[PDB]
Amino acid sequence: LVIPEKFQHILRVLNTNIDGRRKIAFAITAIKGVGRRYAHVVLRKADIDLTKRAGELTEDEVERVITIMQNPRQYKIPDWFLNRQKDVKDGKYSQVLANGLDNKLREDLERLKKIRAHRGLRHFWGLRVRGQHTKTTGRRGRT
């Protein structure tokens, strides 16, 4: 439960190294999807006291957090609350950790150019998605 000495710098994702200085409800922002109000709500309903700090981060805490982030239905959390609802190019519903599998889905530039779609060409040149009109004004990129 409470223990003065459990401070470790690294959490396990794909054997890579992360930061471990942030406090609780903020130390699990190192995961791509977890963080913001997602980590806040999982710690809020985790039935633990939130006054704990980085040094009192127990291994049971981390194990339960990893299990809860594996599947959202621990407290009946719908999939859209995660960054990835029903996936593109496959019929899954979850976000995948690490790199090389989720980022493979994001590359969306060639196939839309096959149908001569505007979205794919826009993402092909690295242009604006929000639709920022460009006439002459703008102070980013070349100076």
Binding site: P4, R21, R22, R53, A54, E56
Partner: peptide, 9 residues
Amino acid sequence: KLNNLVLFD
């Protein structure tokens, strides 16, 4: 760079 004392000692 955020780096401070977070250890209980």
